[PDB]
A paper describes a structure:
Here, we present a strategy for the de novo design of a simplified scaffold of an endo-α-N-acetylgalactosaminidase active site, a glycoside hydrolase from the GH101 enzyme family. Despite lacking detectable enzymatic activity, the experimentally determined crystal structures of a representative design closely matched the design with a root-mean-square deviation of 1.0 Å, with most catalytically important side chains within 2.0 Å.
Specifically, loop regions ranging from Gly50-Gly65 and Glu210-Val220 were poorly defined or lacked electron density (insert I and II), correlating with regions displaying increased dynamics in the molecular dynamics simulations and low pLDDT confidence score. The dEngBF4 crystal structure (form 1, molecule A) was aligned to the backbone structure of the designed model, revealing a Cα RMSD of 1.0 Å across 191 residues with respect to the OmegaFold model. The specifically restrained catalytic residues exhibited a Cα RMSD of 1.2 Å across 31 atoms relative to the OmegaFold model and 2.0 Å over 34 atoms relative to the EngBF enzyme crystal structure (inserts).
Numbering used by the authors: 3 to 49, 66 to 212, 221 to 292
């Protein structure tokens, strides 16, 4: 219920553009922690971008977990049928969808939730045993393949509660059902700016963490005024080292922001 501040670091593998090597990610996390040892860190893993090997992700997660950071991971569910096209009532069960790569057939909603989603979570826990804190379910909750019933949503939220995981959401479509099940939620930046506000902050304060892009004192002031109790603050930058420059500047500016707000509320 007391207000808490978190520093959000986006971590993706090197590509022609930005990203960061495992060594750069570890070096950045060490400097960020040294700059604000009293502020939590949330690592947004896997978010023209490169990809990590599994061993690289494991080394990154191990280093961040040892520092005490929380990890948000992209589950990256396969929701399109095993490329082999389908010819029967499976066609009636596989919703045809056109993406940037043409026609695809969604995996039947029953087979995904029953066997494929729990297996993906089991493979996830086997690779990062007890080291993940939030999971991203874009293709499941906000994809063009599935419209989950309220019963199916609670079944999913039960699958990640069993693994001790929260969820990072890109939309408010299932928000109220998310808090009702008592799962931790990480609200992405530009979710409302892309309607739900105060009521849940007063209802479930310790369940909601809102990620905001820092601009000025108004960023922290508006979040506190709206009732947010956990504010994950993302700074500018693209690669991990470029984010480090913005974070180190932002830690100094945010200290002045909180100090000025404290004198006004005194």
């Amino acid at each position: 219920e007391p207000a808490k501040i978190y520093i959000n670091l986006g971590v993706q593998a090197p590509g022609p553009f930005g990203g960061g090597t495992p060594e750069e990610v570890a070096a950045t996390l060490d400097r960020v922690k040294a700059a604000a040892p009293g502020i939590g860190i949330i690592v947004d893993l896997d978010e023209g971008a490169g990809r990590y090997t599994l061993a690289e992700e494991q080394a990154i997660v191990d280093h961040a977990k040892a520092l005490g950071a929380e990890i948000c991971y992209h589950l990256n569910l396969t929701v399109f049928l095993p490329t082999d096209p389908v010819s029967e009532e499976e066609r009636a069960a596989a919703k045809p969808v056109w993406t940037w790569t043409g026609l695809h057939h969604c995996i039947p909603k029953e087979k995904l939730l029953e066997t494929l989603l729990p297996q993906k979570l089991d493979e996830l826990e086997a690779a990062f045993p007890g080291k993940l804190d939030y999971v991203y379910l874009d293709r499941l909750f906000d994809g063009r393949c599935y419209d989950l019933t309220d019963e199916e949503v609670r079944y999913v939220l039960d699958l990640i509660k069993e693994r001790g995981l929260g969820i990072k959401i890109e939309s408010t479509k299932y928000l109220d059902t998310i808090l009702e099940s008592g799962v931790k939620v990480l609200v992405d930046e530009a979710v409302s700016e892309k309607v739900l506000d105060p009521k849940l902050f007063e209802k479930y304060p310790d369940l909601i963490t809102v990620e905001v892009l820092y601009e000025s004192i108004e960023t922290i002031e508006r979040a506190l005024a709206a009732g947010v109790r956990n504010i994950a603050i993302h700074f500018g930058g693209y690669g991990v080292v470029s984010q480090l420059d913005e974070i180190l500047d932002g830690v100094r500016a945010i200290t002045e922001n909180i100090l000025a707000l404290a004198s006004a509320g005194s």
